[PDB]
Amino acid sequence: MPFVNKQFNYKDPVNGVDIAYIKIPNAGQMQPVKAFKIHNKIWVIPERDTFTNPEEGDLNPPPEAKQVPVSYYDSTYLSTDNEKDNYLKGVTKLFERIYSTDLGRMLLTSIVRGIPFWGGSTIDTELKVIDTNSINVIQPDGSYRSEELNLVIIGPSADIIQFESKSFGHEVLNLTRNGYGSTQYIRFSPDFTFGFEESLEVDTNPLLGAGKFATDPAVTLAHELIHAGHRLYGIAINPNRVFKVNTNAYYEMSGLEVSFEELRTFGGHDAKFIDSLQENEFRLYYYNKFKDIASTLNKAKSIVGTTASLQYMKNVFKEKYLLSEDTSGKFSVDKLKFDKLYKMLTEIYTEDNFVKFFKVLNRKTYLNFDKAVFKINIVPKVNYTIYDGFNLRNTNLAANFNGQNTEINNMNFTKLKNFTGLFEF
Ligand SMILES: [Zn+2]
């Protein structure tokens, strides 16, 4: 069964249900943008993100510096209807490629179940929604209705290749780290990809290689979806917790620090740089958060709003958090169940495991150096498919990851920028 029932076209008429002009409630003032609901709880906005961050409201290139050195600017990308149509089709195709794998079906199911907690009440006896976990949808009569959602895929902001799962903050609460969760906005483009090097000694050296192989963008989207899963379950690791990398002399020359949240998300050997003591600390911390959620639930005796029953919403959260329910109706956290869900979200859903399901070549570690950015077009089936990505069966591209080989499959990649040697190491 496909993940996305509808093969939307960008110019399909609005209907106020799954094709609609919307606003993001605390982006602040914005004009409505056309958006597409591709699955329960999941929307796609084919626009550059000038909305989620007040200080990132324009796309022009210039010299705030060339920092991060890995960056790419084009203020015109994703400004036309044809681009937006292709964006919507590309994103859809990547969701289908992900969903076609058992691991991706598991991850997307977890994401859909991961409704942001109704932790907005100032009154313990009432359960209430946090309104930054919604969008405002223009209805056919021109009025707005509030719709809760879990995930939005949106185009990148000024730096086209800066992909990220981000979310609106709360005055008091760290929603992504307190077990609550919050609606995630993933800046992403299917229209570009990264180069990497097939030899580890080259890929992890900042001075070598031009980016012979292209990352499959399904892996890149999966990576961001894994962050969104952490953040929807409120178990993201504070970016302040960093591996002050000491396993790569070039990282060390520039004092490069990599978050534990990134090492977790990559998985494989990288995750082992989070030591067992610190893993246990995080596991304890988050277990404690789930406990607070159970207590909050138990204290609630009425629901606020007319959307759903209080039993419906307690069941939603009992299912999300896999809570136990006692004879009196008290919720509790079962330690075996917590450890299993935590482990599913953090050890099973990893970039390294997706590479195994997609059978693609990929970076072997997050602790490498980016080589290049390429323009791509995955929408034509002659270029890329749900089942094979670039490595099309029964062609010269089927074997040896030849489809990802940008030299062999050169028609599918246009190098836009080299990053090798730009680095200060
Ligand atoms: Zn990441």
Coordinates of C-alpha atoms in Angstrom, one line a residue, residues 116-320:
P116 CA 3.2 15.9 20.2
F117 CA 2.1 15.6 23.8
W118 CA -0.9 17.8 25.0
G119 CA 1.2 19.4 27.7
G120 CA -0.2 23.0 27.3
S121 CA -2.7 23.1 30.3
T122 CA -1.8 25.2 33.3
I123 CA -4.3 23.1 35.2
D124 CA -3.4 19.5 36.2
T125 CA -7.0 18.3 36.0
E126 CA -7.4 19.3 32.3
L127 CA -5.6 18.0 29.2
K128 CA -4.8 20.6 26.6
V129 CA -3.0 20.9 23.2
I130 CA 0.1 23.0 22.7
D131 CA -0.9 25.2 19.8
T132 CA 2.6 25.5 18.1
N133 CA 2.0 21.8 17.2
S134 CA -0.6 22.8 14.6
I135 CA -1.1 24.7 11.4
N136 CA -3.9 27.0 10.4
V137 CA -5.7 25.7 7.3
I138 CA -7.8 28.0 5.1
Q139 CA -11.2 26.2 4.6
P140 CA -13.4 26.6 1.5
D141 CA -15.3 29.4 3.2
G142 CA -12.1 31.4 3.7
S143 CA -11.9 30.9 7.5
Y144 CA -9.1 29.1 9.2
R145 CA -9.2 25.9 11.2
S146 CA -6.5 24.6 13.4
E147 CA -5.1 21.2 12.5
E148 CA -2.6 19.2 14.6
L149 CA 0.2 17.6 12.7
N150 CA 3.5 15.8 13.3
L151 CA 5.7 16.6 10.4
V152 CA 6.2 19.2 7.6
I153 CA 8.8 18.8 4.8
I154 CA 9.7 22.3 3.6
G155 CA 12.4 23.6 1.3
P156 CA 15.7 24.9 2.6
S157 CA 16.3 28.4 3.7
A158 CA 19.2 30.6 2.2
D159 CA 21.8 27.8 2.5
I160 CA 20.3 25.2 0.1
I161 CA 22.2 22.3 1.5
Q162 CA 21.6 23.0 5.3
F163 CA 19.0 20.3 6.0
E164 CA 17.6 20.0 9.5
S165 CA 14.6 18.9 11.6
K166 CA 13.6 22.0 13.5
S167 CA 10.6 23.1 15.6
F168 CA 9.0 26.0 17.4
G169 CA 10.2 26.6 20.9
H170 CA 8.3 27.0 24.1
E171 CA 8.8 29.7 26.6
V172 CA 9.2 27.1 29.4
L173 CA 9.6 23.7 28.0
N174 CA 12.2 21.9 26.0
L175 CA 9.7 20.0 23.9
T176 CA 12.3 17.9 22.0
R177 CA 14.1 16.8 25.1
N178 CA 11.3 16.4 27.8
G179 CA 9.5 13.5 26.3
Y180 CA 6.6 15.8 25.0
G181 CA 7.7 16.2 21.4
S182 CA 6.7 19.0 19.0
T183 CA 5.8 19.3 15.3
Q184 CA 8.9 18.9 13.2
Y185 CA 9.8 21.0 10.1
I186 CA 12.4 19.3 8.0
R187 CA 14.3 21.6 5.7
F188 CA 15.1 19.3 2.8
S189 CA 15.5 19.2 -1.0
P190 CA 15.3 16.2 -3.3
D191 CA 16.9 18.4 -6.1
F192 CA 20.5 18.2 -4.9
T193 CA 22.7 15.6 -3.3
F194 CA 26.2 15.2 -1.9
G195 CA 29.3 13.5 -3.2
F196 CA 31.5 11.2 -1.0
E197 CA 34.6 9.1 -1.5
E198 CA 34.6 5.3 -1.6
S199 CA 38.0 4.9 0.2
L200 CA 37.7 5.7 3.9
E201 CA 41.2 7.3 4.0
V202 CA 40.1 9.7 1.3
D203 CA 36.6 10.4 2.5
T204 CA 37.9 11.3 6.0
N205 CA 40.6 13.6 4.7
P206 CA 39.7 17.2 3.9
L207 CA 42.3 17.6 1.2
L208 CA 41.5 14.6 -1.0
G209 CA 38.8 13.4 -3.5
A210 CA 36.3 15.3 -5.6
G211 CA 33.1 13.3 -4.6
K212 CA 33.0 10.4 -7.0
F213 CA 29.9 8.8 -5.5
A214 CA 26.5 10.4 -4.9
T215 CA 24.6 10.0 -1.7
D216 CA 21.1 8.5 -2.4
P217 CA 18.7 11.3 -1.2
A218 CA 16.5 8.6 0.3
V219 CA 19.2 8.1 2.9
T220 CA 19.5 11.9 3.5
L221 CA 15.7 12.2 4.0
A222 CA 15.7 9.1 6.3
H223 CA 18.5 10.7 8.3
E224 CA 16.4 13.8 8.9
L225 CA 13.3 11.6 9.6
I226 CA 15.3 9.8 12.3
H227 CA 16.0 13.2 14.0
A228 CA 12.3 14.0 13.7
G229 CA 11.5 10.7 15.4
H230 CA 13.8 11.6 18.3
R231 CA 12.3 15.0 18.5
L232 CA 8.6 13.9 18.3
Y233 CA 9.2 11.5 21.2
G234 CA 11.0 14.2 23.1
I235 CA 14.2 12.2 23.4
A236 CA 16.7 14.4 21.3
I237 CA 20.1 14.9 22.9
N238 CA 20.9 18.5 23.7
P239 CA 23.2 19.8 21.0
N240 CA 25.5 20.9 23.9
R241 CA 26.4 17.2 24.4
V242 CA 29.3 16.9 21.9
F243 CA 32.1 14.4 21.0
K244 CA 35.1 16.7 21.0
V245 CA 36.4 14.6 18.2
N246 CA 39.8 13.1 18.8
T247 CA 39.8 10.3 16.3
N248 CA 40.5 12.4 13.2
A249 CA 43.6 14.7 13.2
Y250 CA 42.0 17.1 10.8
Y251 CA 38.8 17.5 12.9
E252 CA 41.2 18.1 15.8
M253 CA 43.1 20.9 13.9
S254 CA 39.9 22.8 13.7
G255 CA 38.5 21.7 17.1
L256 CA 35.5 20.2 15.3
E257 CA 32.8 19.1 17.8
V258 CA 30.0 16.7 16.7
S259 CA 26.8 16.3 18.6
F260 CA 25.9 13.0 20.2
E261 CA 22.5 13.4 18.6
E262 CA 24.3 13.2 15.1
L263 CA 26.4 10.2 16.2
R264 CA 23.3 8.4 17.5
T265 CA 21.4 9.2 14.3
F266 CA 24.2 7.8 12.0
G267 CA 24.6 4.7 14.2
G268 CA 27.1 2.0 13.3
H269 CA 30.5 2.5 14.9
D270 CA 29.8 6.3 15.3
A271 CA 27.3 5.6 18.1
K272 CA 30.0 3.8 20.1
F273 CA 31.6 7.2 20.7
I274 CA 28.8 7.8 23.1
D275 CA 30.2 5.9 26.1
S276 CA 28.1 3.4 28.0
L277 CA 27.9 5.6 31.1
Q278 CA 26.6 8.5 29.2
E279 CA 24.2 6.3 27.2
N280 CA 22.8 5.1 30.6
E281 CA 22.5 8.7 31.8
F282 CA 20.4 9.7 28.8
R283 CA 18.3 6.6 29.0
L284 CA 17.6 7.4 32.7
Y285 CA 16.9 11.0 31.9
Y286 CA 14.3 10.2 29.2
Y287 CA 12.8 7.4 31.3
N288 CA 12.2 10.1 33.9
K289 CA 10.5 12.3 31.4
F290 CA 8.1 9.6 30.3
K291 CA 7.3 9.1 34.0
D292 CA 6.4 12.8 34.3
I293 CA 4.1 12.3 31.2
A294 CA 2.3 9.4 32.9
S295 CA 1.8 11.5 36.0
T296 CA 0.5 14.4 34.0
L297 CA -2.0 12.1 32.2
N298 CA -3.2 10.6 35.6
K299 CA -3.8 14.0 37.0
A300 CA -6.1 15.0 34.1
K301 CA -9.8 14.4 34.4
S302 CA -11.2 16.6 31.6
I303 CA -10.2 17.5 28.1
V304 CA -10.1 20.9 26.6
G305 CA -11.6 21.4 23.1
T306 CA -14.3 19.5 21.1
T307 CA -12.0 17.7 18.7
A308 CA -11.5 14.4 20.7
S309 CA -12.6 12.7 23.8
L310 CA -10.3 12.6 26.8
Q311 CA -10.3 8.8 26.6
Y312 CA -9.3 9.0 22.9
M313 CA -6.4 11.3 23.8
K314 CA -5.3 9.2 26.8
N315 CA -5.3 6.2 24.5
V316 CA -3.3 8.2 21.9
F317 CA -0.6 8.8 24.4
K318 CA -0.7 5.5 26.1
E319 CA -0.1 4.0 22.5
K320 CA 2.6 6.6 21.7

